[PDB]
Design an enzyme around this catalytic site. Structure first.
Site, PDB file in Angstrom:
ATOM      1  N   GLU A  11       0.769  -1.226   0.000  1.00  0.00           N
ATOM      2  CA  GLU A  11       0.000   0.000   0.000  1.00  0.00           C
ATOM      3  C   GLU A  11       0.807   1.286   0.000  1.00  0.00           C
ATOM      4  O   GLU A  11       0.277   2.298  -0.421  1.00  0.00           O
ATOM      5  CB  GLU A  11      -0.976   0.042   1.197  1.00  0.00           C
ATOM      6  CG  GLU A  11      -1.872  -1.192   1.209  1.00  0.00           C
ATOM      7  CD  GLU A  11      -3.007  -1.145   0.190  1.00  0.00           C
ATOM      8  OE1 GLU A  11      -3.058  -0.035  -0.519  1.00  0.00           O
ATOM      9  OE2 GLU A  11      -3.810  -2.037   0.073  1.00  0.00           O
ATOM     10  N   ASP A  20      -6.693   6.441  -4.966  1.00  0.00           N
ATOM     11  CA  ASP A  20      -6.154   5.112  -5.103  1.00  0.00           C
ATOM     12  C   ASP A  20      -6.152   4.641  -6.572  1.00  0.00           C
ATOM     13  O   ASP A  20      -6.460   5.422  -7.439  1.00  0.00           O
ATOM     14  CB  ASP A  20      -6.740   4.146  -4.129  1.00  0.00           C
ATOM     15  CG  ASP A  20      -8.112   3.670  -4.488  1.00  0.00           C
ATOM     16  OD1 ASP A  20      -8.637   4.156  -5.541  1.00  0.00           O
ATOM     17  OD2 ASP A  20      -8.697   2.903  -3.818  1.00  0.00           O
TER      18      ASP A  20
END
Ligand code: CL
Ligand code: CL
Length: 162
Positions: A11, A20
């Site tokens: 991440e 994202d």
């Protein structure tokens, strides 16, 4: 290596609101804020999550704290899921970490959707599961990450992360 380090690698860490891979507002270590297109809406969910007026920026400790909560919830969510628990229970420690990663990314419902791969994982048919896991939107959209998690389920080692 462990779940935390593994997800930290997958991440990354960002201290300002960012979008994202799906274009959704996120912050920290993969903490989804909202699927709403609105930045204000995101800033608002952020302040609600931290408990203060952040103005879209947080510190490292705050990021880490969201992360801890996020990992705990993923585990707890797996344990409460009738479709997931048995799988998780059947696995060794390394592969359990791969299952968590996936729930962290896609949510419990999303993973519960890999019904066929789950059955294979439960039966311990590693190569077949790996092949089936690869036939998914998941793999086509985030192939590098997907390959890392798949190798982990295939081998039972952390080699893809070393
Ligand atoms: Cl939260
Ligand atoms: Cl990727």
């Amino acid at each position: 290596m462990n779940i935390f380090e593994m997800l930290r690698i997958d991440e990354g860490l960002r201290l300002k609101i960012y979008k994202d891979t799906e274009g959704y507002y996120t912050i920290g270590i993969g903490h989804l804020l909202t699927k709403s297109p609105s930045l204000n809406a995101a800033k608002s969910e952020l302040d609600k999550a931290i408990g203060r007026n952040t103005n879209g920026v947080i510190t490292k400790d705050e990021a880490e704290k969201l992360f801890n909560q996020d990992v705990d919830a993923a585990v707890r969510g797996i344990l409460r899921n009738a479709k997931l628990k048995p799988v998780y229970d059947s696995l060794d420690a390394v592969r359990r970490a791969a299952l968590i990663n996936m729930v962290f990314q896609m949510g419990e419902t999303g993973v519960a959707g890999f019904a066929n791969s789950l059955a294979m994982l439960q039966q311990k048919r590693w190569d077949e599961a790996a092949v089936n896991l690869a036939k998914s939107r998941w793999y086509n959209q985030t192939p590098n990450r997907a390959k890392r998690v798949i190798t982990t389920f295939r081998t039972g080692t952390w080699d893809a992360y070393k």
